[PDB]
Structures are given as structure tokens and as C-alpha cells.
Amino acid sequence: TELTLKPGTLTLAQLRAIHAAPVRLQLDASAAPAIDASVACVEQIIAEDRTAYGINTGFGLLASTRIASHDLENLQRSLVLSHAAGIGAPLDDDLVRLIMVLKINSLSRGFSGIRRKVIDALIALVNAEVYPHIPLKGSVGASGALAPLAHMSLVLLGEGKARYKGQWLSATEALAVAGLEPLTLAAKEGLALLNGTQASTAYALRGLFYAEDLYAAAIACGGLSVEAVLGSRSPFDARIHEARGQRGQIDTAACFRDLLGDSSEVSLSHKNADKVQDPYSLRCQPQVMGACLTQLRQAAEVLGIEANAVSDNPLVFAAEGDVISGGNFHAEPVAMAADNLALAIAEIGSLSERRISLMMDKHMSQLPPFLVENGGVNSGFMIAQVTAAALASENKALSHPHSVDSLPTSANQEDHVSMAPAAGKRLWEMAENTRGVLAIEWLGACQGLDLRKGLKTSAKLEKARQALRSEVAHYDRDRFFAPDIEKAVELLAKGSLTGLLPAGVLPSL
Amino acid sequence: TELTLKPGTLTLAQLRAIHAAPVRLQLDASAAPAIDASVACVEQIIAEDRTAYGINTGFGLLASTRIASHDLENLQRSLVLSHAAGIGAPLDDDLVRLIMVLKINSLSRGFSGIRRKVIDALIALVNAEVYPHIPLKGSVGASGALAPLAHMSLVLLGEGKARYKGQWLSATEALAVAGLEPLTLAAKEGLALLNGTQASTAYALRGLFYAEDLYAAAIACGGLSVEAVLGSRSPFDARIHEARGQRGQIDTAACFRDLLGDSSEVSLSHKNADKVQDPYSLRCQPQVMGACLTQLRQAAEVLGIEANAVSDNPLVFAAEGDVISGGNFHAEPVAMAADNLALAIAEIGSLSERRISLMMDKHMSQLPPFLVENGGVNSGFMIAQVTAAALASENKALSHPHSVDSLPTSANQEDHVSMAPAAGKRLWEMAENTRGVLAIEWLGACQGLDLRKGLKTSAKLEKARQALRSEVAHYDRDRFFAPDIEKAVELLAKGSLTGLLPAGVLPSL
Amino acid sequence: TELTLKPGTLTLAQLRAIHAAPVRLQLDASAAPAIDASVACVEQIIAEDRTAYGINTGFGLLASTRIASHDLENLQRSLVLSHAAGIGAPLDDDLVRLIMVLKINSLSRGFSGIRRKVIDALIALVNAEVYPHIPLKGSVGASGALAPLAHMSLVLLGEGKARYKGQWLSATEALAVAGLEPLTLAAKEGLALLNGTQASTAYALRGLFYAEDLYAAAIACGGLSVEAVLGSRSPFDARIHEARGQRGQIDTAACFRDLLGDSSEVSLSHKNADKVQDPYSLRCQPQVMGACLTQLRQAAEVLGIEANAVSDNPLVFAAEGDVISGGNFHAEPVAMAADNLALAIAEIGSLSERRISLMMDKHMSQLPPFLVENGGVNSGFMIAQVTAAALASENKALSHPHSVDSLPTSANQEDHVSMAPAAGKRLWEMAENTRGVLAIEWLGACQGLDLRKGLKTSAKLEKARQALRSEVAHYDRDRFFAPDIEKAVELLAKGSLTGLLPAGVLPSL
Amino acid sequence: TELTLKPGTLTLAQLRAIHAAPVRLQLDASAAPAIDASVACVEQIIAEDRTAYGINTGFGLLASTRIASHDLENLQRSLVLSHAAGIGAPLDDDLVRLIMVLKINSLSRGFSGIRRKVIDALIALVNAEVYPHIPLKGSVGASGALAPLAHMSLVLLGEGKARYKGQWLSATEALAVAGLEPLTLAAKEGLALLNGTQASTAYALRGLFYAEDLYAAAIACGGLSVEAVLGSRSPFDARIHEARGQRGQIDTAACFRDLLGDSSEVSLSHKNADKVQDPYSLRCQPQVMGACLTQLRQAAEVLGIEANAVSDNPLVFAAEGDVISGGNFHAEPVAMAADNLALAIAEIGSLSERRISLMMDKHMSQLPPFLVENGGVNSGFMIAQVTAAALASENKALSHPHSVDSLPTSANQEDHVSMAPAAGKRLWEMAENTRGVLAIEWLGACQGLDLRKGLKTSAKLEKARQALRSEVAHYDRDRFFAPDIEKAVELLAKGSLTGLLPAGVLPSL
């Protein structure tokens, strides 16, 4: 997938693509002038013997002291070497890549004052599929992607290590792989590379994509459970949704009618489609899932903007010759988006679990008192029904927001931070919880529909049944179930059901 | 303030007005046809001997059993009498009113099948300033505003009690005050009155308004602290914000430049406006407060929509002659908005506290090591600086989201609920925490600027100084401070500083 | 109730008594020597021209500078005047009193270096039922009960205000009421009065007592629901509990067998007492309530110790002539106890709610599908069953611990604090949630047993039925229920059911 | 390490040993009679044609229906096969082993009615170092260790897979390795193996051990930082601690005096040991760490008891010939212990972080404004100081308790559960956060003391310096730090500093 990048125009779709697979990129020519221009600004500042913080001053107490021009190259290197004090397991190549591409997009907007040749270097590591070692922990989402970003730049200066073809090489052997040589940095270039919200942004983005995949899956899964228990379609009537006027819900109901259709053999084979009321977990799916869609749409907007943001410091405005110190490196926005996404992920998992319970019960579904065929011979999946409770419950605590916490770092000058990295990181596990839950819904609904011998559900829903059944057989009775769940989870993770959702509903899809 | 209501067109401003003070309303004539029409639909259903759930069936197991037409009037009354099982202190007249006006707006959209004369009754209690007894607790944000809504309708049937001129009268003496008589209800009218998201919506709305008032105040307060410590204005440079591309932050910075202006006597009296970097708590105000503005804007949209929503069940579509049972009574959306608003309220309080700390410190401000004049003679407000820490910390726990919790009610048919009432209720206390924090910032900044003898800050900021000083004197030293805070809180609560913020920034303002 | 206090020997029972009602106290003569002795130590330090921090140094930067002896009296007064920067509503007389008695107990251990005449003053305000104004907020549980304690001492120096006979008098008119005159303080006496963990300790203690009252009530209530639904007694078999070896549970089961007895008319009237298994919410009561008892016993121990603790600074050891600065003013222990107690309170509320649900369901009880007599005529308390869900759910968020939060105060010298005040304060509301829940259980079980015409439960349980029925009639059908709950709550709050629990189970009882 | 097990006498030390390394065990002869006896009870129940739930009834609706005696062997197998519906990664051999040994201890108390030959089988898999596949997720801590326990028993019946010499074999090849053959089960044996609190108990135990290791480490680390910044020893004066009367704190102070001694070259080289007050993070170490010790001691007691508990159902009392159904399988106690331990782990991490901050600051330590040697040349570890903030902050959210959550499983008969597995699982990550924090403290203090050329600290503390320096060199300046942290973490994880703490302080140590 070749991209000709025009900085700051990244869409969430492209971001999905970048997160998902290898990317080949090159810059758009419209890019060259602003980048090159911001460098000449920095360059003339130096030459006019002027002194500017972030450009040619020292740091802290010395933030006021000029650094010998020839002293400047060692500053960079000291900055990079010093900040790589992260901790944890190393990010998978996917996230690295994404972060690499986000930093590139960001620098290339020509507000950062670093040479194109340095940007060009990053791009070359991207194109070569060489991914610098980045550890999961250390950043508080304020003062630049500081460790993760430092760990990234290490390889550029022939330091640290990088992964290639799944093997750890040296920052040197790997630079060569990319057709490069160890690089030396100039004024501002140290602060340009190490500062930004890219790490936290990639974390939050992965969570959004995850939240997105679960959403889609949940519409297919909730559609089967409606059928499995011979539920109504009336809860999906467009008019009820337009009368509430909630868009998330409006679009969600629409998605539901699309997948279920006006009726099915299954649905048609039950006298009427009204009688007894359906339980909230069925009936209020548009409302709840609808609320969830809104949530993930709000975050997506914030995150869509941040992915193209000029997030370093200080920023250089070559047109006016100004260099300004701000705080764009503060990822509060991103943190809140991550926290936002937590609620949607949890509540999708919550609703699916109650549908599982419904299904297993001696009614809430209208099938076997457990699906199997007697609580006394065996006792089917009342149990997988327990596993989903355990996963759903977890997400309740994981929902605790991180954007409200903060610790005064490095001498109460850095007296308020975001915690965006942790806000976002936790969504990944939250999505695993919700994914196992749905998988169990998926397996349960298909088991149940199965019991309704020879009957068929909607066209999209029969596709969802077949997707499962292509890899997991009907579990009609006593035998080790864990491996069914395990398999269902994978298919979900491979986006098995994603294609059934109508297009343009989800931000990145 | 007279309003001629056109149902479902309520703006957040009008809602602010309704929440804030007595409202006189009447319906717009364009209203009459749909309302009257939905009634005739219900009415013809009855007459054609047809039986429809929510209209003329029983409930639960009997949800399938027709109720003798003449039996129907007692159903209503039984519904109302039965659901008023709430708990807690009674809502203040303000919230009652708001809820009353939201239910009225909702019913009048003519999807609810209840007589105009019943709507007219509600409106008359509004116009008369007669507020039925509603207790704070009982609702789970699903199955209709059920208790609070039941407690409301009680007065209509000459039951319960209502508050008038701050006194509890009987639902009878109070009905009369409104020029009314006890009412009898007809088919569907019981479910129309008791079902809806109005209670939770009013709770969340009050929180939004609160969050809004704090925001504004926080821009004035953060502006004074910048001055108090001779901070920079460069962090507010429009260009840095447009380069990030975040709107919340863009608008926030703009608000800051508006209040501070390019410079002040105070600011002008300090050699330069660059030198040492400002601490995050100063520098990253656009970023953080900007993130907060976004948050409260997202919720406002959801809540703005819900205030005009047709939230009862089942809904009647007279044009097609259809009566449909959905789940619009599920307040998931509202719950998430409330949870959303929690983060903004907390983080506004968080940033203000670190500014207080900065100010009290032997620097972070550039004034007295505590503001007073020596930690050894007395020791000023290092302490009020402690009180703000206690209030800020609280909001960290209060931020725990309620929209992720749910309990299966009334026999796992109501197997998923929202918890919207609690999500929203908790914001009120959260705003008190943040308001005390800011008050202390307000008092501190004015104390500090004071110390800079005879110097003046911006025009809007001098207005903020004077607003304080008009009621709270300079606290130049040893004497009981609590009463300063107490006073500052009130002024804040009376919206003292709200008028300084530029117009059209905040949803309801 | 006259007490002759021997400092540091307070029991939790006496503390319950002090919290619960007016106390008359006087010191034990064994007290005089250590108190008087610590004063003479301070006094000789002064006279030997020695200089000691906390005794005769300044504060902060000046913590190293000696204060003119004649300057010392104004230090006290400055300390008191300065720290009273609290916020919130004023504590009820009960809590004030308790705090007053805890500070008295503490000082009197003769480690604090303050005159008996000053202690004597406090005691006189206690004996006279004069309660100084203390606001709920401001303290972070570290650096002395600082504001609340300052607000307390205000009255002593003829400042602030005090409540007497429920009226706010002046610290002067109120001092006189106590037979006193405004007092002047000496070296160390300022730090002795304002520093300590008494405020947080009283907060946590009130929560413990609350948690205690709920526990007892929950054994009576859970006993009725077992009967109401014709549950088994076998889950209470001593042998099952001794086999687990958990003491909390062992004692809890014992309490259950005591209240239910081997059998009842009710229980005897059902063929057997085995058949179908009982649901966890019945069967696992010893286990869950047992876990809860342990929790509240652990906290009680910590809190029992803290109530007698010498918590000021610095401390004076007259025997060796030493004055030492420590940090006993850090209430971490208390904070954790408060957080501890949160889990017990929540989980008691949680189990009671599921018993309500069980009862309302068309089984889980064996009575009316809702208790009333048809979901279709009326529909009874399926609803009060909703109110309990709302109260139970709240406690889930309120359980979020405060002892994990901390903010660096007054210049990172006070860089770690406890947050004990908030940890404890929140339990009070948590107990209201759980109390409403139980009240609803209480009312429901009695309603249900009622339906079993003319049948009787255990002797203690019939007492519990009668306690209710003495004030709340059988609610056999359609009519306003809220007022039933309201009434039940009160009785619970008046400890109505507390006397049925066997003695010596609960720490303070 | 050979053990001759006398059931239910396990100590926490032995449990530490079992968790930590391979165990060889055999039963004590005193064991044989009760085990064998409970079997004959079950056996005679069968033979007398009597029917008993859990023994020879069906399940659920059929819980009342007798199972053909010859039908019974297939019941077991169906039970096992059915409940293995867990999810997640497989537990490490350590935890498996521990769980295996806990179930063995439990069954062997002869209340479970299963043959010794079946117990003997488990023991043989333990002795052979063959560890059945157990996935991390699925259990809600109620209804028996159900999935994890089912997954365990799978191998016994020649199903599933087991790990041996770090390789996954078949339950068959692995049974053989243990010298076994696939087993068939009899009455009650299915419920005896699958039911219990062992899984959650092992999870919580690992957390306790972790919490224990961190505690010790934190005393050594906090001792070095006191020295690094030339802090006082007076805060550790026994008298201050006895005056508070808190035991945790009393023992903690004692531990501190033991490690620091009355004085050191370092301490001796600073004029006095009083002057300026130390910051809370130093001074209040006994108080905070003391509160933490209490917390972990409380949990340990509960967990110590649970490890020896008879936790299955129903239980058999051969002496009286009774078979009783209780609910000992409800792990509420364990859940609360796990939640309890969370607070200690967090607060240990919290205090260490503020000590790091202190150290890095241009004071709070008295060393380099960052440790390195100028914020302007390089800038040392102000950064690792950031990494610790990120880890400490995480633990704030992870502290959210799981014992307050619950979901009604398998048809509201299982209407209240514990969530003990998740309460405990989360402590492991929480300990990683706190361990990285301390590691960074460790590295920082040693770096700082280093700067005090040629000076020495206490004898135990010099051992702690050397432990580090044996593997991590002084990091005197600019170069990649991450690998220092990485290394320090490992040493901590290998219990490097554990041996310095005086004996008998910690429950398991």
C-alpha cells in the first residue's frame, strides 16, 4: 500500500491501514518548502548570534544560558541518550510503525525545525520494515513522548536495537538494512524528535480500532441472539429511533435492520413477532449500542485530530521568524478520549453478557435450559456463561479513568501531566475481555439457532453462522469447550464479522 | 420569561434559563394536531376492540391479557401509586421545574398518546410555581423515570404533596393553587407520564451547567495567577493552538488572549515575557482546559438531544396507526454524558490546584513564600492551599464512572439498566469540590497581585479582582481565613465571573 | 454517663457511647503527673535558653530560628488563627464531641507538653455540651487535624463560634457557658492542639459504628427472607463453618442459628428443609457476611488503637528530657481502615439486594410474583426492588479507595499525605445506601411472611417483624410505598434491630 | 524439599516455599482415616438406596432426581468435561503447582468424600513436576474453582494437556510420566475436585508474597534515600512509635533502626542530625509503611486460613453420617484480602516515588539538581523519576476493588459471586509497577550516595549498595539508562534485598 503523504491530512481509515499492515510512504512535494523553511529559521537564529530556548539554550536553570554552537550537536545526542529510561515489554511492530508514521506526519508539517533528511531517515526505516525498540512504559503523556520517543531516536544515532524480520538487530545493522548510516543531530532536532503525543496517540488509536471491531461484531452477535430466542424486530423500527433523535442509536438501529431484514424463516416460523415484551438486553440494543457508537465517535474525532497535530516544542513559525514555547506536548485530550473509549468497550461487553445469560436461562431464549440438553445429564455452556461474567466484571474496574490522575514531575515545573499512555494502554485488555464475551455470545447463538432444526436466519446472519461453523463445529454436548471459545476469539480478532456491518458507520471503517 | 413552546426545539440556553429561574410557558398551536392525533389513535384502538400492549394490556405475565375498558382508568392510578417508591431528600424546586418542563416538552411532540388537557395540567403547575415532591433516589435510568416520575404524577391525581412558596402543601391544595382539580387518567397515559429519561436528563444538565460555570471562572482565575506570578502570554499564542488543530484548545486559548490582552502594567513591569519557562500548570492551560471544553461540549450535544427526546413507551405513530414498544427509556447515552462531564470537572479542579500550589511556593509565583509574609511569623494560606488539595483529591474517586454498572431488575426482563441518575447526581458535589478550589485560586491570585503594590492587570481581570474585593478584603495576614473561602465560593456560585468569558464559547452560554 | 478518664484506655464501646450521646468526663488522678511533667520539660527547655523545633523555633525556613520567649504566646494564636481555613457544612454535635474527647484522651497521655488547664478547658466544653464550629472539609489527614482542629481551638481563644442547645453562640458566650474565659497559649501548645489524627479517626469511627449497625440488621433481615421464601437452615450448620476455619463466617453462622433456631412453625410447615438448593444469596450468607465481619473487625482494631494514640508533633519525653519530631500525624492507617470498611458496607448492601430480587421474583421466594398479588392488577414492590438496585450500585463507585491518592502540599516537604478524612467521610453515605436496601429487605420479608397466613417465624425474628409492624402496616396492595421505606429506614437508624444480635460479636457491641 | 503433609496445617512459609519451588510431598498417616472414612459414608449412602444431592442427584431442576448408580461414573466425567470452559494464557508452573498442593491439602482433610487414590494421583503429578494446563480466566470465585479446577482434573481423566520440563505433553503421556493411568471418578468426586477456592487463593497468595518482597525492599531502599539526602534517624525513634501504639508502624520503625543503625560515616559527616525537618516522604515512612504492613498482615491471616480450608460442596460428616450443602465455595473473604493487599502495594509504590522526586530535586536530597551533574549538559535521571510517576499512577486505578462487583450467573440461583480471581490476579501487575518504582529508588539512592565520595552508610545498607553495584555500575552521566532499571528490577525480583530485613516481621518470612 503506497502512500504519498501530505502532512496532517491523515484519515482514520489510513491510520487503520497503517496500524494494520506494512506501509510504504514518501513525502508529497508540497511538503518540502515548510520543512526546509523552518530549518532555515532555526539556522538564521544561530547565525545572528541570537539565543532561543529549545533551539540553543541549555535546560532547566540554564534554560537561560546559550550553548556554544559547536556544542549543539552533543546536546541532541545527550537529550536522546538521557531520556531513553522507559520500562516494560517492547511494543509490537504494528504500534512502533504507527508511532513512526505519526511522528513523521507531525514533523513534516514544517513547524518543527528539523531537516528533511532526518525525516527522510524515519520514513526509510518505515519503508524498510525496521522497527526500533520501544518499551511499553515510562511516559506520563507530558514533556514529549519522552522515553518511547527517545528509544525510537536511539536507533537513528546508531544506538539501541531495532527489530527486523522479527529479529533484534543492532541500531547499526538495522540502519544499514534501511540503507542508512548513524545520524548526528542539530539545533532543536533533539526536542523535535523526543517531544510529542504520538506514543499515547497510537495507544488510543489501537483502542479505538479495537472498540470499532467489537462494535461491528456486537451487531452481528446481538442479531443472532435475537433470532436464537425468537426475539422481535420491532425494537429496531426506524421511527422509534428518529423520535428519540439520538444519532448513534439512529445509525445503530439502521445497522440492525440491515443485518436482520424485515423477517426470516426462523422469525417467520414463530406465530407473531410481538406478544411478550423482549428483555432490555434485546430491546434496548439500539439505545445502549447507540450510546456506545457516539462515545467511540467522539474519541475518534479527538484522536483523528491529534494524529495530524504538531505536538513538539518549542514550535517554529518561519513566516514571522518566531520561535515559541507552548505545551502542545500535553496529551490531556488524548487521555480523555482513551477514558471515553473505556465506557463504550465495557458497555458493549456488558450488554453481550446479559444476552448470554438470557440465552442460557430456561427462557430468556426459548431454547434448552442451558443450550446443551439438560442440567442433569451434562449441562452445556451455563458455564461459558460464567466465563463471560468474569470478563465483563473486570472491565468495570478497568473503566476507572486515568485522565484524572497526575503527579508533579521534575521539580513542579512539570506540575501537571496527562497519563494518556496508561489511559490508552488499558483499552487493549478491555477489548480482550469484551472480545471473549462476544465470542461466547457468537458461539451460543449459533448453538441455539442450530437447535431450531433446519431453520435459517438473515442473509448476513447466516454468513455469521457460517463464519463460525467453518472452524468451530456445533458443540451439541459434553466435550471440552474452552477450545471453542479460543477459536471464536481468534476469528473475531481476525475481523471475521467486521465485513457484515454497513459501510460508513464507524469512523475508521 | 414567557415561552411559547414548540416541542422538541428546546435549546441549551433556554434549558439553562429554565433550570435557573421560574418559567412561564404555553404551547405553540403547531403542537395541538400531533398530540390530539396520537390520542385518537389510542382511542380508536380501544374502540375497534383491538388489544395493544402499553395501551390496553396488563403487565408482566398478563402483558398478553386485555384490560376491561372500564378497568383502564384504575390501571393508570395503580401504575402511578405503585411506582412512587423513591428515597432520599426532595429535589429543589429548580430541578423539579426542569424535570416538569422536560416531560412536557417530550409529551407534546405527540408521540405519547396522552390528552393535551393532561399536558396542559403539567404546564399549569409549572406556570403557578407549584413543584411536586420528588425524592433524589430510586431510579436506575431504565424502565421510565419511574419513581421520580411517579412521585411527580402523584400530585396530578390529588395525591402526595407539592411545594409552593417554599411550603409543602397537599397535592389538592396545590392543584387548586394551579387552578386545577385532581385528574383521572386514560389508556397509555400512565405509561406516558411515568416513563422517560427526564429525571436523569435534568441531573446531567445541572452538572453540565455547573461544569460550564466552573470553566468560565477557571479562565478568569487562571488569568490572574499567570499575572500574580508574572507568567508568560506566549503559551496563548493562536499559532501554537491552530498548529495542534484541537478546537477546544483553540477556543480556550482565544478566551485567554481575550481576558489577558497582549500585555498589562503588571506584565509590562517585568523586563521580558519569556526567560524561564512557565510550569505546565500555567503553560498547558489551553491544552488541559481545552481538553475539558471538548469533553463538556460532547456531553452537551447528547444532553441537548435528550432534552427534546420522545422517551416513553410504547410510542404511538398515528400516521400509520402503529403502536410500538421500544426502549427509548434506556438512558445509557445520558449516563455516559454524565460520566464524561466528570472528567472535565475534575481536571479543571486539578489544574487550578496545581496553580494554587505554584502560587504558595517560594517561587512558582515569585511572591511571598506563602503569600502572607513569612512562614515563621504567621504563614498565610499555605493552608488554604491544603484545603484545595483535599477537594481536588476527592474528585478523583468521584470520577469513577457509573455507566459501567448495572443490575438485573424485575426478573431479568429488565436485565440491563443505565444508572444515569447517579452518574449525573454525583457531578453536583464534584462541582462543589472544584468550585472551592477555584475560589481559593481566585482569593490567592488577588492576594498576590495585591502584593505588587499599585499594579494593574487586564481590564477583564481587574473586573475579576474587583468582584472579589467588593466582598472580601485583602487578607494581608493572620486572621480567620475560612470565611474568605466561604464568601468566594458564593460569588462563584452566583456566577460572579461568568460574564467575563467571550460569548458563544460554552454550549448553554 | 460519667467517665473518669484514664488516658489511652478508651474502648470501642465507650467510643460508641461517646459518639452516641452526651458525655460527662473528668480525668483520672493517675493522669496528672505525666501531663504536668511534659510541661515542665518544655518549660525547662525555654529557661535553659535552649532552642527546640516545635517548641520555640519558627516554621519553615525559620524552623531553625529561635522565637523570643515573650514572642511565643503570639505564635500559638497565629498558628490557630492561620490554620482555620476549612470548608463545608459544620459537623453535627455528635462528631464534634467525639473529636473533642479523642483530642483530650490524646493530650492527657502527657506526651504533648500542654498544660492540664488547657486540657481541663476542653473537658469543660465537653461536659457543658458546647460544640465548637467544625467544617467538614479541608484536611488531607496529614500535618495535624489542621483545619478542623484549628477551628476547634478557635473557641478556646475566644474566637469563632460554638453550638449550644442547637444554637450558634460566640466563642465567648459559649466559653462562659462552659464556665470559662478566653485562653492564651504557651510554647508547643499550638502544635499540640492543631496536630493529630482525631478528625479522621472520628469520621472512620462513625463509619465503623454504622457498618456495625448494618451488619446486625442484616442478620435479622436475611433471617426473615430465608423464612419468607422457605429457605434452608442447613447452610448455617456449624460444622460447615468450622471446616472452612474462617472466624468471621464462623461467628456469623452462629449468629444466624441463634436468630432462626433449629426450626419454626413457618419452616416446619414445609414438608422438608432440603430439596432444591437455595440460591447463593441465601446459602452463602455466612461466607459473605462472614467476610464482611472480618473486614470491619480489622478496621476496628486499627481505629481502636488510633483513638488512644499520641498523634501530635513534636512529642516530648520528659523522662529523658528529649523532644522529637516524628510523623504520627500521618493518618495512613486510618485511611486504609476507612477504605477497608467500604468493602464490608458495600457487600452487605449487595447481598441484601440480591435477596430482595429473589423475593420479588416469581420464585426465589415462593410467594407472589412480586409480593403484591399480580403484575397486571397493580404490581407491588418489584419497584422498591428497583430502588435497592440504585442504592446498591452507588456503593460500587463509592468503594473507590482514597488512601491511594496523595498530593504534595506546602512545598514538597509535605510531599505525601493520607486523605483519611475523605476515606472515612464517604462511609456515611455508603451506610445510607445500604440502610435503605436493608429497610426494603425488612419490609419485603415481613410482607412475604405475612402472605403465609397466621404463620410464625423464630422468636427473635418475630420480634423483628413486630418492630416493623409497630410502625409500618402490611402494604398488601396499591398505595404509596415511599413512606414505608422512609419509616423503615428511620427504625433501622434508631438501631431498631440491633438488640437481636447475640452479644460480643461486633467490636463496639 | 520433602514434606510430609498433615492436612490443614500449612503455614504461610511452606506456602511461600511451594509457590517458589518444586515440592515433594507425601501424606501423613494421621490423614488416612478421615479421608477413607468420608468415602465409606458416601459409599453407604449409595448402598442404602438413599439419595443425596451432590452425591447421587442430578443437577438443577433434576437436583431432585436420583442418578442410576451405574450412571454415576459418567456424571463425574461429564462434570469435568463440561466446566473446562476457561480462557486466557496458561498459568505458570509455579501457580499450577501451588493450586495443586492447595486442593490436595483441602481434600485430604477427609471432608470431601473422594478416594485417597484420587488424592494420591494429584500428589504424584506434584512430585513428578507435571503441571496441567490452566488458563488464567473464567472463574468468578463462586461455584467451585470451576473452570481452572476443571482444566486441572482433565489431565486426571486422560484429557487436556500438561506441561513437563517446560513442554506441553498429552494428559496421557504426562500421566505416565507421573507413573499414572487415566482415572475414572465416583460419586461426589466430580464436585470434590471442581469445587473450591484454591485458584483464587493461589492468586491472592502470590500477591501477598509479592507485597511482602516489595515491603522488605522498600525498607532497604528508603534507608538509602535517607542517607543519600542526609536525612534524620530521629523519625525512627522507638518512643514515637510506641506512643502511637500502632504495631505495624512499631515493627516498621524497628526494621528501620535495624538497617540504619544509630549512625553512619555518611550521617556522622553531617554536622547534626536534626536541623531542618525532613519531608513526610522520609519522616513518615514508619507511619505509611507501617500502615502497609498491617494491611498485608490482615490479608495474610485470611489467606493463611483459606489455604487450609475445606472449600468444596456438599461436605460430608462421616462421624454423624451427614451430607450437607453449604457455600464454602464462595471466596468473598479471599476477594477482600486481595483488594486489601492492593492498597498496601500501591502505597508502598507511592511513598517510594515521592522519595525519588525528593532525590532528583535540587534539594529534597542535597545532591545534584538531578543526580547527574547539570540539567544543561545532560540531565541524569530526572527522567527515571518520570518513569516511576507513570508506574505509581497506574496503581491508583488498579486499586479499584473487585470484591464489590457481582453478576447473577446460571439463573439467579448463583445470584451473588465473589470475583476473587480478578481481585488477586491484578496484584501481580501492581507489584510490577511498584517494583520498577523501587528499582529506580534503589538505583537513585546508590547513585546519590556515590556522589558523596568515599563515604559509607550502614552495614546492611552497604550490602544493598553492593548488591546493586555488583551488576549495575554507577551511571555517573549520559548513556542509555533503561538497561539499568531493567537490571535493577530483576535483582529485586530475585529477592536481592529480601535478606536484609530482620526475621519474623512478614507473615511468610
From Swiss-Prot, chains A, B, C, D:
<dbReference type="GO" id="GO:0005737">
    <property type="term" value="C:cytoplasm"/>
</dbReference>
<feature type="modified residue" description="2,3-didehydroalanine (Ser)">
    <location>
        <position position="143"/>
    </location>
</feature>
<dbReference type="InterPro" id="IPR001106">
    <property type="entry name" value="Aromatic_Lyase"/>
</dbReference>
<comment type="subunit">
    <text>Homotetramer.</text>
</comment>
<dbReference type="InterPro" id="IPR005921">
    <property type="entry name" value="HutH"/>
</dbReference>
<keyword id="KW-0456">Lyase</keyword>
<dbReference type="Pfam" id="PF00221">
    <property type="entry name" value="Lyase_aromatic"/>
</dbReference>
<feature type="cross-link" description="5-imidazolinone (Ala-Gly)">
    <location>
        <begin position="142"/>
        <end position="144"/>
    </location>
</feature>
<comment type="similarity">
    <text>Belongs to the PAL/histidase family.</text>
</comment>
<dbReference type="GO" id="GO:0019557">
    <property type="term" value="P:L-histidine catabolic process to glutamate and formate"/>
</dbReference>
<dbReference type="GO" id="GO:0004397">
    <property type="term" value="F:histidine ammonia-lyase activity"/>
</dbReference>
<keyword id="KW-0369">Histidine metabolism</keyword>
<comment type="pathway">
    <text>Amino-acid degradation; L-histidine degradation into L-glutamate; N-formimidoyl-L-glutamate from L-histidine: step 1/3.</text>
</comment>
<dbReference type="InterPro" id="IPR008948">
    <property type="entry name" value="L-Aspartase-like"/>
</dbReference>
<keyword id="KW-0963">Cytoplasm</keyword>
<protein>
    <recommendedName>
        <fullName>Histidine ammonia-lyase</fullName>
        <ecNumber>4.3.1.3</ecNumber>
    </recommendedName>
</protein>
<dbReference type="GO" id="GO:0019556">
    <property type="term" value="P:L-histidine catabolic process to glutamate and formamide"/>
</dbReference>
<dbReference type="InterPro" id="IPR022313">
    <property type="entry name" value="Phe/His_NH3-lyase_AS"/>
</dbReference>
<dbReference type="InterPro" id="IPR024083">
    <property type="entry name" value="Fumarase/histidase_N"/>
</dbReference>
